[PDB]
């Protein structure tokens, strides 16, 4: 297969095929299926050597995960593309892999044709001859102590559509089928003691035709707002490499994390300074809050159990991205080992972002004034996880900051509610017979920093009143306050939470350098405020399977391939065992001061559904920012042409 331009480029359709052919041969005569075929990124050290020390081009490797009929668990390994050969392989019989769209799509037809499920539909008020009106979102079983990882299992959240164009979510059924993914048979059905038959109300729909019938008619089309860039865009791409407003970075993508930003640097007037080696979302967990059975099984780790890549929406059609867009496609392997493509998986573009900065002199009534508008570069993707959509926006700014914006939209995870049943404290009745359970949306931002070079550290920064009292010579008027910096020496020290009491922020800095003006080390500060405490209790399924979610910040030593905090194979893992973040933390004694570190940030929101969220919910925003603090010696955007600028002398001169 042909080598890619960049060592970090995703595998090409050709590499994917080359890889699967190679694997198929190695397992000649075996009935195998492909779960994952993806780039095994080069070692950090080797990449940097290649990039800045004229070192050799790293070997082009493919990581694969396959299933073999009649064999428990999975088999994984590495394929060396240059020599078309398996160079590493092993079997993991007590593990279950990520669920692909193929894995998911087959489940619905099998429950529709299962006698037991059918009987349950009839009991629920649905004629056995109308099973084609029964639907289901096939989820991982998450984890169920009755089966462990002994069988690859899915749990089906069953719904009903009276018409194929309805939004099924207003009509959930009360039971839950457990399906053997690689046997295609229902092995058990969780049935509640309290039975609730199908809602007899009409579906809560949202397409225009439905709206016209529900309310009067649609609103008149609104006067258009057109955005044009007649002279082109200011950013430049060379393959997957981006260059914009002094930023230079590589836009990668994979089945699991979706967008992966690597080798990020800023051109400080000729001095090209590294910022991050790699940054992305490494895991998620959406824990529901009803303690009732079998709702404990609702705490999807979407990234690790489905993949933000595999689930990504093709962005072109929807008009998801406005303006002069540049797209990237994604390529994966299918069960058969053939490359599959999702067109326009990532969308890139720049847009106006308000004021960058402004200042006027009151002396001549603001005649003396300078105003510079801000423009941002946005690398985006949007993925669907059954009922919900996650809109991801990586944003680069002209003040050197990098921001991650997320918008939650889509549809509420709903369960059935009896006519006189109280949605209790665990959920909300958002429509007759519909219970939308409380749940949190937590994300794990993985940052591999290289702040102004190698050798980094992290610290918590808390605002505090001077400890001296009001009236003391040291704090006569009691207004004194400072920022207390606690730099993490050991892993244990980094396990910290956001604290509103100190308006806490965290710094990722380079202790080996010093800002010539402030005398502080150069840094990027994490300013993140939407940091929910993990509500599920210690020892809970949720807490055990997502060890990283317990703290807002987790800093561990760097090691090649420390990507996924809940383990490499998340589905059906009980949470017991030393793996993922639990393994990286170890006894918490390892050094993380002035070395190669990994910074995992947990953030997100706690969602208590309200009717406004139904039947389709308005976007809910989440954001975090990484700001350069003491990184530059002055505002880095002053050499950007102002939108307006009048000097005091010019103001005078102007009559």
**Position 531 contacts a second copy (CB under 8 A):** yes
The CB-of-618 to a second copy minimum distance in angstroms stands at 3
Output the smallest distance, CB 441 to Cu ion, in A.
Answer: 5
DSSP state of 39: E
Span near a second copy by CB under 8 A; candidates 43-51, 152-160, 271-279, 386-394: 386-394
Q: Can 174 be counted among the known catalytic residues?
A: no
**435 pairs with which residues across the strands?**
415, 429
CB of 3 to a second copy, least distance (A): 31
Q: Which residues are annotated as a binding site for Mn(2+)?
A: 448, 596-597
- Per rule CB under 8 A, is residue 194 in the interface with a second copy? no
Does residue 607 belong to the site contacting Cu ion (CB under 5 A)? yes
Among 371, 493, 550, 583, binds a second copy (CB under 8 A): 371
Total residues contacting a second copy by CB under 8 A comes to 175
Q: Which among Cu ion, a second copy, none contacts residue 546 (Cβ within 5 to 8 A by kind)? A: none
Tell me the DSSP string of 546-599.
-GGGGSSEEEEE--TT---TT-SS-TT--S-SS-HHHHHHTTS-SB-SSB-EEE
Six-digit token string for 399: 């003040």
Residue closer to a second copy, measured from CB, 2 or 227: 227
Judged on CB neighbours under 10 Å (0-12, 13-18, 19+), 268 is middle
- Please give the annotated binding residues, written as ranges: 300-311, 385-390, 439, 441, 448, 596-597, 607
CB of 637 to a second copy, least distance (A): 6
Indicate which residue of 166, 263, 302, 452 is catalytic: 302
The DSSP secondary structure of 592-651, one letter per residue, reads: -SSB-EEEEEEEEEEE---GGGSSSEEEEEEEEEEEEESSSSS-TTTTSPPSEEE-HHHH
Q: Is 525 in the site for Cu ion (CB under 5 A)?
A: no
- Please give the torsion angle defined by the CA atoms of residues 123, 124, 125 and 129, in that order, rounded to the nearest 10 degrees: -70
Q: Centre a 10 Å sphere on the Cβ of residue 128 and count the other Cβ atoms it contains.
A: 10
Q: Which stretch, 198-206, 512-520, 530-538, 601-609, contacts Cu ion (CB under 5 A)?
A: 601-609
Contact segment (CB under 8 A) with a second copy among 195-203, 248-256, 407-415, 584-592 equals 407-415
50 CB burial (10 A radius; 0-12, 13-18, 19+): middle
Q: Please give the size of the binding site for Cu ion, defined by CB under 5 A.
A: 1
Nearer to Cu ion, 200 or 358 (CB): 358
Piece in contact with Cu ion (CB under 5 A), picked from 318-326, 340-348, 565-573, 606-614: 606-614
Least distance between a second copy and beta carbon 131 (Å): 15
Could you tell me which of 566, 560, 591 has the C-alpha nearest to residue 581?
566
375 or 444, CB closer to Cu ion?
A: 444
* Measured distance CA(448)–CA(368) in Å, rounded: 44
Token readout for 295 is 């709702």
In DSSP notation, 135-174 reads: EEEEEE----TTTTTSS-EEEEEEEE-SSTTS-GGG-B-S
How far is 370 from 358, CA to CA, in rounded Å? 6
Longest CA span, the chain:
90
Q: Give the C-alpha distances (Å, rounded to integers) separating 602 from 208, 283, 442, 496.
A: 38, 9, 7, 10
The SS3 call for residue 259 is: strand
Task: Write the interaction track for a second copy spanning residues 437-466; mark x where CB under 8 A is met and - where it is not.
Answer: -x-x--------------------x-xxxx
Cis peptide before 294 (omega within 30 of 0): yes
- Write down the catalytic residue from 169, 255, 388, 431: 388
Minimum CB distance to a second copy, residue 605 (Å): 8
Pick between residue 85 and residue 267 the one whose CB is nearest to a second copy: 267
Contact letters for a second copy, residues 621-640 (x by CB under 8 A):
------xxxxxxxxxxxxxx
Minimum distance from residue 545 beta carbon to Cu ion (Å): 19
One residue of 146, 200, 336, 366 binding a second copy per CB under 8 A: 366
Tell whether residue 339 is a contact of a second copy (CB under 8 A). no
Task: Point out which span in 31-39, 179-187, 497-505, 588-596 binds a second copy (CB under 8 A).
Answer: 497-505
Say whether residue 550 binds a second copy (CB under 8 A): no
Q: Residue 583 touches which of Cu ion, a second copy, none (CB < 5 to 8 A by kind)?
A: none
Binding residues for Cu cation: 439, 441, 607
Closest distance between a second copy and the C-beta of residue 342, in Å? 9
- For Cu ion, the closer of residues 264 and 401 by Cβ is 401
504 lines the binding site for Cu ion (CB under 5 A) = no
Length of the chain: 655
Buried b (16+ CB within 10 A) or exposed e, 605-625: bebebeeebbbbbeeeebbbb
Give me 404's structure tokens. 């991650």
**560 scored as a contact of a second copy (CB under 8 A):** no
CA distance 435 to 414: 6
Per-position x/- string for 302-321, each x denoting binding to a second copy as judged by CB under 8 A, each - no binding: ---------x-xx--xxxx-
DSSP summary character for residue 83: T
CA distance 302 to 429: 25
| Cβ proximity to a second copy, 30 vs 358, nearer residue | 358
Which residues face 500 on adjacent strands?
Answer: none
Q: What character string, x for contact with a second copy (CB under 8 A) and - otherwise, covers 499-528?
A: xxxxx-----------x-xxxx--------
Q: Is residue 293 within the footprint of a second copy (CB under 8 A)?
A: yes
| Contact flag: residue 588 with a second copy (CB under 8 A) | no
**Structure-block tokens of residue 197:** 């038959």
- Would you call 266 a catalytic residue per the annotation? no
> Which range of residues in 33-41, 246-254, 426-434, 602-610 is near Cu ion by CB under 5 A?
602-610
**Binding positions for a second copy, 58-97, rule CB under 8 A:** none
CB of 115 to a second copy, least distance (A): 23
**Out of a second copy, Cu ion, none, which partner does residue 230 contact, by CB within 5 to 8 A per kind?**
a second copy
Q: Scanning the structure block, which residue is given the tokens 């890889």?
A: 19
* Residues facing residue 65 across a β-bridge: 36, 76
Binding residues for substrate: 300-311, 385-390
Confirm or reject binding of residue 299 to Cu ion (CB under 5 A). no
Does 298 help bind Cu ion (rule: CB under 5 A)?
no
Phi, then psi, of 574 in degrees rounded to 5: -75, -15
Q: x/- site string to a second copy, residues 144 to 173, per CB under 8 A?
A: --------------------xx-x------
346 binds a second copy (CB under 8 A): no
282-317 residues labelled b (16+ CB within 10 A) or e (exposed): bbbbbbbbbeeebbbbbbbbbbbbbbbbbbbbbbee
Give the tokens for residue 432: 């007759």
Minimal distance, residue 552 CB to Cu ion, in Å: 19
Query: Which of 82, 207, 561, 588 is close enough to bind a second copy by CB under 8 A?
Result: 207
| Residues within the interface to Cu ion (CB under 5 A) | 607
- Which residues are marked as active site? 302, 388
């Amino acid at each position: 297969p042909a080598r890619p331009a960049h060592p970090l480029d995703p595998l090409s359709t050709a590499e994917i095929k080359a890889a699967t052919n190679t694997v198929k041969s190695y397992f000649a005569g075996k009935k195998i299926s492909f779960n994952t075929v993806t780039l095994r990124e080069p070692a950090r050290k080797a990449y940097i050597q290649w990039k800045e020390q004229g070192g050799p081009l790293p070997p082009r490797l493919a990581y694969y995960v396959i299933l073999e009929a009649g064999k428990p668990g999975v088999k994984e390994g590495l394929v060396d593309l240059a020599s078309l050969s398996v160079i590493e392989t092993r079997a993991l019989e007590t593990v279950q892999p990520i669920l692909t769209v193929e894995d998911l799509c087959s489940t619905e037809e099998v429950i529709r044709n299962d006698p037991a499920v059918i009987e349950q539909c009839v009991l629920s008020g649905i004629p056995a001859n109308e099973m084609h009106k029964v639907y289901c979102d096939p989820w991982t079983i998450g984890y169920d102590e009755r089966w462990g990882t002994g069988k690859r299992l899915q749990q089906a959240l069953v719904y009903y559509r009276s018409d194929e164009d309805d939004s099924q979510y207003s009509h959930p059924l009360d039971f839950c089928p457990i399906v053997d993914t690689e046997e295609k048979k229902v092995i058990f059905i969780d049935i509640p003691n309290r039975r609730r038959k199908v809602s007899k109300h009409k579906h809560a729909n949202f397409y225009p035709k439905h709206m016209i019938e529900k309310v009067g008619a649609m609103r008149p089309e609104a006067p258009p707002i057109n955005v044009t860039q007649p002279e082109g865009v200011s950013f430049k791409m060379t393959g997957n490499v981006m260059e914009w407003s002094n930023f230079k970075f590589h836009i990668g993508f994979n089945y699991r994390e979706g967008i992966v930003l690597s080798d990020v640097s800023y051109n400080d007037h000729g001095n090209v300074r590294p910022i991050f080696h790699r940054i992305s979302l490494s895991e998620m967990i959406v824990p529901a809050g009803s303690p009732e059975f079998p709702h404990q099984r609702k705490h999807a780790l979407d990234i690790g159990e489905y993949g933000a890549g595999y689930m990504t929406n093709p962005l072109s059609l929807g008009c998801d991205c406005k303006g002069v867009i540049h797209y990237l496609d994604a390529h994966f392997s299918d069960r058969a080992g053939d490359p599959i493509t999702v067109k326009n998986a990532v969308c890139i573009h720049e847009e106006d972002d308000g004021l960058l900065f402004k200042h006027s002199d009151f002396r001549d009534n603001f005649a003396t004034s300078l105003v510079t508008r801000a423009t941002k570069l946005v690398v985006s993707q949007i993925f669907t996880a059954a009922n919900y959509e996650y809109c991801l926006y990586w944003v680069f700014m002209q003040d050197g900051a990098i921001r991650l914006d997320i918008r939650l939209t889509g549809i509420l995870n709903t369960y059935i509610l009896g006519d006189d049943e109280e949605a209790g404290p665990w959920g909300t009745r958002v429509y007759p017979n519909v219970n939308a359970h409380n749940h949190q949306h937590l994300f794990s931002l993985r940052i591999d920093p290289r702040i102004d070079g190698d050798g980094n550290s992290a610290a918590a920064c808390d605002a505090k009143s001077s400890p001296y009292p009001l009236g003391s010579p040291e704090n006569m008027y009691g207004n004194a306050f400072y920022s207390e910096k606690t730099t993490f020496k050991t892993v244990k020290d980094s396990l910290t939470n956001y604290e509103s009491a100190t308006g806490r922020s965290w710094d990722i800095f380079n202790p080996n350098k010093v800002n010539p003006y402030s005398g502080k080390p150069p840094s990027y500060k994490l300013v993140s405020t939407q940091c929910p405490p993990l509500l599920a209790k210690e020892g809970s399924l949720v807490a055990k399977r997502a060890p990283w979610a317990s703290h807002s910040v987790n800093v561990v030593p760097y090691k090649d391939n420390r990507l996924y905090p809940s383990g490499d194979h998340v589905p059906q893992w009980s949470g017991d065992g030393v793996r993922g973040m639990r393994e990286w933390i170890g006894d918490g004694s390892e050094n993380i001061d002035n070395t190669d570190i990994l910074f995992f940030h947990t953030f997100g929101i706690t969602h208590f559904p309200a009717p406004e969220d139904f039947p389709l919910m308005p976007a809910e925003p989440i954001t975090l920012m990484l700001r350069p603090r003491h990184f530059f010696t002055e505002n880095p955007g002053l050499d950007i042409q102002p939108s307006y600028a009048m000097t005091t002398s010019e103001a005078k001169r102007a009559v």
